[PDB]
Structure 1
Amino acid sequence: GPAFEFAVAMMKRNSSTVKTEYGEFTMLGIYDRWAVLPRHAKPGPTILMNDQEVGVLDAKELVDKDGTNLELTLLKLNRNEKFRDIRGFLAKEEVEVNEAVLAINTSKFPNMYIPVGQVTEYGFLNLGGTPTKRMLMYNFPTRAGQAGGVLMSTGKVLGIHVGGNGHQGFSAALLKHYFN
């Protein structure tokens, strides 16, 4: 319940629905004009954010110190409004919790919240042929179109959902140092 209340408030304050040429995704704004999308959203020079064209001034595909994919792309938007700064909800390291909620908001899944239970730091996954690290894992019946969803627990933003296989979902851990 507390995770759900936290999630609804967080989504209302910091999330949007985004379309890139590669698909439709939930997008979380972090601070200033920096937001995050799963890497496979492959944003171009402009995105559609809540049905409106928004320019992308910079983008950074995140990899670790040895170039290993982290499956996140940070984007700096050409926007006057600043995101409410939620870096205080981002952990310095991968978070494990017993009860989390995954929040999605797209035209396919509007305002939907899913209790996913326990989140575990799984670490390495080969995603489509791409070695990837810092993966958080949780179980629920996954569906296409959920990437970009926000994984949260009471007082914490844990990660961004990047993929699912059957009843297994996974998020890239959303770490504080990615935003300074």
Structure 2
Amino acid sequence: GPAFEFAVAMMKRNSSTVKTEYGEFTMLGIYDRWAVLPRHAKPGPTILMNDQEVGVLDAKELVDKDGTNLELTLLKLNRNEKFRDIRGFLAKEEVEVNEAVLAINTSKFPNMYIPVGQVTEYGFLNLGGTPTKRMLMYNFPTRAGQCGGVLMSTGKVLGIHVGGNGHQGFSAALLKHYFN
């Protein structure tokens, strides 16, 4: 109950639906005008956010100290509204939880919440052909269209859904240090 209550308020206040030329994704605003999308959404100079064209002022594909993919792209958006600052909900290091909720907000999956069970630090995973670290794994028949989904537990935003192999789903951990 508490994790779903947390997730609902979090999506209401900080999530949106984004369409790029590579698909439709759930997007999570972090603070000010900075939001995150899975890297493979490959946002261009403009994205459709909630059906409307929003310019992207800056985009950064996150990588670790070795240059290894983290599968996250941080975007600075050209719009007046500031996102509610959720950085205090982001851990300093990968969080393993016994119960997590995956929240999706797309045209196809508007306001949907999925209890995915145990989340474990999976680590390295060759995703869509690329070595990727800091993956959090959960055992759910996950699909595309869930990409960008927000993985949460009570009072914690754990990561963003970036992939799956038809049986397990994986989220890029959303670490505090990525946003200062």
TM-score, with length taken from structure 1? 0.99
Whole-Å separation in 1 of the counterparts to 2:96 and 2:165: 20
Whole-Å separation in 2 of the counterparts to 1:130 and 1:167: 19
CA deviation after TM superposition for structure 1 residue 27, in Å: 0.3
Whole-Å separation in 1 of the counterparts to 2:81 and 2:143: 32
**What does the per-residue CA deviation read over 1:110-133, in whole Å, with 9 as the maximum and x for residues that have no partner?**
111000010000100001211100
**What does the per-residue CA deviation read over 1:128-150, in whole Å, with 9 as the maximum and x for residues that have no partner?**
21110000000112122100000
CA deviation after TM superposition for structure 1 residue 97, in Å: 0.5
Whole-Å separation in 1 of the counterparts to 2:89 and 2:140: 24
Whole-Å separation in 2 of the counterparts to 1:57 and 1:106: 23
Whole-Å separation in 1 of the counterparts to 2:94 and 2:28: 18
Identical amino acids, percent of aligned pairs: 99
Whole-Å separation in 2 of the counterparts to 1:58 and 1:171: 23
Whole-Å separation in 1 of the counterparts to 2:2 and 2:96: 16
Whole-Å separation in 1 of the counterparts to 2:135 and 2:170: 6
CA deviation after TM superposition for structure 1 residue 172, in Å: 0.2
* 1:177 paired residue number: 177
**What does the per-residue CA deviation read over 1:1-51, in whole Å, with 9 as the maximum and x for residues that have no partner?**
111000000000000000011100000000000000000000000000000
CA deviation after TM superposition for structure 1 residue 59, in Å: 0.4
| Secondary structure of 2:65 counterpart | coil
Whole-Å separation in 1 of the counterparts to 2:2 and 2:165: 28
User: Across the two proteins, how many residue pairs are aligned to each other?
Assistant: 180
CA deviation after TM superposition for structure 1 residue 75, in Å: 0.2
CA deviation after TM superposition for structure 1 residue 90, in Å: 0.3
C-alpha RMSD over aligned residues: 0.6
TM-score, with length taken from structure 2? 0.99
Whole-Å separation in 2 of the counterparts to 1:73 and 1:85: 18
Q: 4+ residue runs of structure 1 moved beyond 3 angstroms?
A: none
| Secondary structure of 1:177 counterpart | helix
CA deviation after TM superposition for structure 1 residue 165, in Å: 1.2
Whole-Å separation in 2 of the counterparts to 1:132 and 1:163: 11
